[PDB]
Paper text:
pmcHuman galectins (GAL) are oligomeric β-galactosidase-binding lectins assembled from small (∼15 kDa) protomeric carbohydrate recognition domains (CRD). Among prototype galectins, galectin-7 (GAL-7) is recognized for its preferential expression profiles in normal epithelial cells. For example, while extracellular GAL-7 can trigger apoptosis of activated T cells following binding to glycoreceptors via its GBS, it can also bind E-cadherin on epithelial cells independently of its GBS. In this work, we studied the impact of homodimer interface mutations on the induction of Jurkat T cell apoptosis, allowing us to positively and negatively modulate the biological activity of GAL-7 by designing a covalent disulfide bridge (G16C) and destabilizing mutation (G16S) to control homodimer strength, stability, and biological activity.
To examine whether these functional changes are rooted in structural perturbations at the molecular level, we solved the X-ray structures of lactose-bound WT GAL-7 and that of variants G16C and G16S in their apo and holo states. In contrast, our omit maps clearly show the presence of a bound lactose molecule in the GBS of both protomers within the WT, G16C, and G16S complexes. This is likely explained by the use of different crystallization techniques, i.e., soaking of WT GAL-7 crystals in lactose solution versus cocrystallization with lactose (present study). In a similar fashion, the ring opening of glucose was previously shown to be catalyzed by the amine group of a nearby lysine in the binding site of human serum albumin. Cα B′-factors between apo and holo WT structures show that chain B is less flexible, while chain A is more flexible in the presence of lactose. This indicates that loop 1 experiences distinct dynamic behavior in each GAL-7 chain upon ligand binding, an observation that was not immediately obvious from a previous GAL-7 dynamic investigation. In the presence of lactose, loop 5 Cα B′-factor values decrease in WT, while conversely increasing in G16X variants.
Residue numbers in the entry:
A (entry chain B), B (entry chain A): 2 to 135
The structure:
Amino acid sequence: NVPHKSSLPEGIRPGTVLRIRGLVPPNASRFHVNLLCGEEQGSDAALHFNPRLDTSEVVFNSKEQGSWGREERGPGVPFQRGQPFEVLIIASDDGFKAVVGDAQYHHFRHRLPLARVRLVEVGGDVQLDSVRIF
Amino acid sequence: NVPHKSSLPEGIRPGTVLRIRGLVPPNASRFHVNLLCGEEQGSDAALHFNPRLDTSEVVFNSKEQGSWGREERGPGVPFQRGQPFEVLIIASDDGFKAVVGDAQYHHFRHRLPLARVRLVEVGGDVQLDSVRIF
Ligand SMILES: O=C[C@H](O)[C@@H](O)[C@H](O[C@@H]1O[C@H](CO)[C@H](O)[C@H](O)[C@H]1O)[C@H](O)CO
Ligand SMILES: O=C[C@H](O)[C@@H](O)[C@H](O[C@@H]1O[C@H](CO)[C@H](O)[C@H](O)[C@H]1O)[C@H](O)CO
């Protein structure tokens, strides 16, 4: 599938909503949504949101200087192979709210300053219908 | 039609998202989304968002101590009688972003402080499928 990768040169601020609509392929392993602080491979990640169909979990984390932080896991897995989905990633002063379907799923407190984010990437085993930043 | 009215006793903040899904009746005239600062119908309004199918405009305004402020109008009318719609009202530190469909429609600067909001009303000529505060 074609991934999404787009620059946020003015950054994101509290009140930013990333809306992602798509379908999990029937043979999917994992896909990811990253909010990154640079363009180079290995750049710091303010948020890594990683639905894992192969291991029935959704992992949240950050990355600084090449190292992963403490993993946070949401409750259950609100994604199914072969099914469409809608995700909101909502930025506040305190963190990122992940909404899947009709309910908040998990809240990830900021570890890196939000002002460091300047790129969004959506990739892995996912068919994207739309990616929008409001 | 059945309206929505729910309390926000803790107020709202940058990163609050109101997601409204519904259908505009085929003979609709107007409907509204209000963020109010009290429990009475005449309570101050931090946001009054008023799609008007009868006069082909969408009006934004605030109300304080019984008086309306300066009206703001969006570009065109992204609603149609008989059609379903999705609206996001997204709060930032600077204002409310109104998203309709796949695009930001208008940005309305705060006239009232966010901390004063404590009620959300959705009513008028509209059929509501979902009202959520994220
Ligand atoms: O934590 C242990 C779990 O068993 C597993 O989550 C971890 O995997 C990485 O997790 C990263 C996010 O913390 C990121 O997703 C990366 O891509 C993954 O390889 C570990 O490295 C070990 O397997
Ligand atoms: O032609 C534009 C007019 O300015 C018209 O829009 C005004 O309508 C009110 O507008 C309010 C929001 O400003 C709110 O919607 C109220 O319910 C409406 O009666 C009123 O006739 C005069 O103030």
